[PDB]
Amino acid sequence: EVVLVNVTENFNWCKNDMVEQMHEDICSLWDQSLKPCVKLCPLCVGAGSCNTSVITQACPKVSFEPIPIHYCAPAGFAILKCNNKTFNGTGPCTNVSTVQCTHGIRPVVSSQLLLNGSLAEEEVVIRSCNFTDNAKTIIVQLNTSVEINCTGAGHCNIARAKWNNTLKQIASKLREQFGNNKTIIFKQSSGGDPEIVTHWFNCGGEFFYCNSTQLFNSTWFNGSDTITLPCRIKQIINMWCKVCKAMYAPPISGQIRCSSNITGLLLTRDGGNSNNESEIFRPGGGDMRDNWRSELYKYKVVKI
Amino acid sequence: DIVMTQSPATLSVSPGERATLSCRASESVSSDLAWYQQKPGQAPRLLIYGASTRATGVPARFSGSGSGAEFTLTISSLQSEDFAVYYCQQYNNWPPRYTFGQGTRLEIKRTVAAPSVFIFPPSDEQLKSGTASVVCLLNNFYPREAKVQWKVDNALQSGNSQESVTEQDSKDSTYSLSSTLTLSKADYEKHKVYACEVTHQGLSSPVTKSFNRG
Amino acid sequence: EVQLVESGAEVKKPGSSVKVSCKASGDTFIRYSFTWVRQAPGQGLEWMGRIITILDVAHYAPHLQGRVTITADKSTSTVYLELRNLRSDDTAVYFCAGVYEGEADEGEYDNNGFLKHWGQGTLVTVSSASTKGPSVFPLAPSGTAALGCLVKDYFPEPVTVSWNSGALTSGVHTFPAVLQSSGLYSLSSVVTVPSSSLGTQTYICNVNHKPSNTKVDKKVEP
Amino acid sequence: KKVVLGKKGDTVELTCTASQKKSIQFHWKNSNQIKILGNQGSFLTKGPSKLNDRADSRRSLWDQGNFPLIIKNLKIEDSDTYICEVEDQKEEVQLLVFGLTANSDTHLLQGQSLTLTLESPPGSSPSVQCRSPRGKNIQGGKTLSVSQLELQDSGTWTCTVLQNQKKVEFKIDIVVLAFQK
Ligand SMILES: OC[C@H]1O[C@@](CO)(O[C@H]2O[C@H](CO)[C@@H](O)[C@H](O)[C@H]2O)[C@@H](O)[C@@H]1O
Ligand SMILES: *[C@@H]1O[C@H](CO)[C@@H](O)[C@H](O)[C@H]1NC(C)=O
Ligand SMILES: *[C@@H]1O[C@H](CO)[C@@H](O)[C@H](O)[C@H]1NC(C)=O
Ligand SMILES: *[C@@H]1O[C@H](CO)[C@@H](O)[C@H](O)[C@H]1NC(C)=O
Ligand SMILES: *[C@@H]1O[C@H](CO)[C@@H](O)[C@H](O)[C@H]1NC(C)=O
Ligand SMILES: *[C@@H]1O[C@H](CO)[C@@H](O)[C@H](O)[C@H]1NC(C)=O
Ligand SMILES: *[C@@H]1O[C@H](CO)[C@@H](O)[C@H](O)[C@H]1NC(C)=O
Ligand SMILES: *[C@@H]1O[C@H](CO)[C@@H](O)[C@H](O)[C@H]1NC(C)=O
Ligand SMILES: *[C@@H]1O[C@H](CO)[C@@H](O)[C@H](O)[C@H]1NC(C)=O
Incomplete structure (x- = not known):
């Protein structure tokens, strides 16, 4: 909406107010939209035990496709956007401008895979707030969508060749960042809550949990046609917003379908000492801010 | 809350015949309806759930239907062990405040049978102890309804005696009933002739059984 | 196929509180939810509350709220009902019931509100009366003859009657007890026999009150 | 420089604490920089450590800024030095089991x-x-x-x-x- 010239602007996607803001808005919208029949939230220290707080409420079944959330500048501030096609969210940017609001953004809730998001405009791009740190999420973003179709009957389908081919594009970009002599391996999640261990997403108002092992089992730079993932709806969630357990009602539809486009991934690097030359990667996520970051990286907000 | 009314209170069905129990809500409860069975002395037995699903162990002659606020249970053919009490439960609302019906009592239907009336004077051992109970008995009758007034010296008594009825006899399908009169040894002797007057459908005129103190 | 076994009968004075348990055998405790249901004599069934065992979250009837607590010790598969500030009208049989709810430990939860499995029931009697054994009086007999026993003035329930040490079963009616205005129970047990039996066959009635640990055998004669 | 003694077969609870009492990202690794256990947002993660199936935290303390590593059913090779990376600070602690x-x-x-x-x-x-x-x-x-x-x-x-x-x-x-x- 205005292309500032002779202007150089530091960005640091890793310290962006917008991310936190979006996150509070999203969380807030789900709470309002999708209410559980029982919500267990523990409160601590005080006394000795940890007095767990319980909220029981009517839990109307509600499923509908989340509409895109545009995010805008609050009274007093301004939104700068970087116009580079490729962009690592850090340092100076010169092709930049001010804008009313950000683009529409699907407030999709999920782990491992980023569904229905923006594709990279050139090549596959990988992001971290510290690649050296084997504890920080690696955000992948694709230039090509990969369909993934899921059903309440308990599975997700994916074209093996498309995926197989997506993995090539990444392992490639990975050994570009960790040495070109390095072997890229993909393995299943290494443990933790089901929501982190499986590719967990919402759909029809129901929470899916899909065994993604089949997607992360290969070795690069060292069959069957359509990958079918076993899944499961659960009524007992670990919440993503705050640390709570929540029980929802069983489903009331026999036709719960979900055709989404994988547009990015949340990986995690094993790392660790081992003069051995190869890098292990596993499907990560769980921290929805990573998800908002995958979309808001090209943005910053500044005192007018 | 959701009130659950069952009808009728008593169902007199003849063995081997068809029973149909009605259960009515005071508002829709979709299909979150269950039917239990209870026999004198034991825990209930879940029959149907979801309005029309037979529980494991239930026979086929049991079947339930309806939804919303209109429910009904059918037993196609009555075994002897099918005569019992039946409750419907709704478990629809949330937070959960589930409610039961008042039950329907299902009983064997048979030919009218008049009672044999027996009357017992108070015991010596008791008279010795202060109080004096008199027992008017109604043996093996049907149907269950009956009227059993006490009349001391031709004086209609009131709120000074208590009745008690048995289950339905598993063998002949009748009932027996005791009406116990209790009054101070003093009042007792204060009067002479102790009558219990019984009215049953199996009888032409009301039957009277009595004795003089002595 | 779980088995629910409850605890013995309770005798409480109004104002006292009571805690009944219910050991649950043979299956996976945290996959079941347990619901306490009670029944006053001659009365119907009343939902008391229900615990979602795996969350330790219980919900209750609005008309008990505040004075009823339901709990569950996962480490011994036992469930508990606590009724506080007891009243005479709280006298009932409290049942313990449960349904299977799904692979709970794996997120699955039907939240079924029916009750497939039951316990044998626990009688809880709330009353001023203090435990005491019955007085047993004969209902001396006098075409056909009928005799019996007057079992009178005991508390609490139940009492057991038999004839000739369970040798005489035929034609025996043991009535359900009544609660007299005194606060004490009293019932009758009658049998009918041949008149040509008096003179030979002598008839005894055995009364057992286990609460008072009393045990009588008053014999009936003409 | 802290040391916590451990009894084989037993459960130890290594502890961690933030200066602020919010509740942010934390992560335990060993001397070899292997990931043991940490949190992603409101969720918990376990790394490719030999502790894995035996590691665990207590998430009710998280809201406090207490990021405990519990190692149930200890073994002797559990003996190592564990680092608690949080808030960018680094808590360290040597565990010896006998x-x-x-x-x-x-x-x-x-x-x-x-x-x-x-x-x-x-x-x-x-x-x-x-x-x-x-x-x-x-x-x-x-x-x-x-x-x-x-x-x-x-x-x-x-x-x-x-x-x-x-x-x-x-x-x-x-x-x-x-x-x-
Ligand atoms: O008021 C209690 C609540 O229970 C219901 C049925 O669930 O009545 C039950 O409980 C009564 C005692 O409170 C019993 O007398 C009755 O037999 C039993 O069904 C409802 O009527 C009421 O809402
Ligand atoms: C992009 O980011 C990387 C690492 O985050 C940095 O080293 C590099 O200088 C940046 N280059 C651009 C395009 O500004
Ligand atoms: C997608 O990006 C990758 C970078 O890994 C590139 O090799 C490929 O040509 C791109 N596909 C197209 C045609 O955009
Ligand atoms: C990135 O992580 C590494 C390894 O944990 C750490 O040594 C380094 O200081 C981090 N970078 C910064 C500047 O925080
Ligand atoms: C997903 O569904 C789309 C149509 O909506 C289809 O074209 C695609 O092939 C499907 N992907 C599968 C089944 O792998
Ligand atoms: C690409 O996909 C095929 C199946 O479509 C897979 O078997 C293969 O390993 C992948 N890459 C190759 C050809 O090595
Ligand atoms: C998931 O399924 C894979 C096979 O597809 C299995 O080997 C893996 O251990 C499973 N883990 C789970 C249950 O998440
Ligand atoms: C992706 O968008 C499609 C198309 O509208 C939608 O049906 C689906 O729900 C979306 N996926 C997710 C995870 O919401
Ligand atoms: C997924 O992406 C393809 C190509 O990018 C697009 O044509 C299709 O409409 C998308 N499907 C959904 C359900 O979003």
């Missing part, structure tokens, strides 16, 4: 020998001390040994291992048969 076992898992006669063995990680050199119910005291390095059991040794033996000026205590139930004449 074990005490009797030569024999059965009843002993009088005048028979008792030999207690101490299982330990390579590198450490701890000193032991044991005391029978009657007072008997022995001590040493790897292997402690009594020459002849006395009847009054029957019961519970207390055994204290001293490592890094820190001691953990053990209780071994010994049985020594009486007899006639």
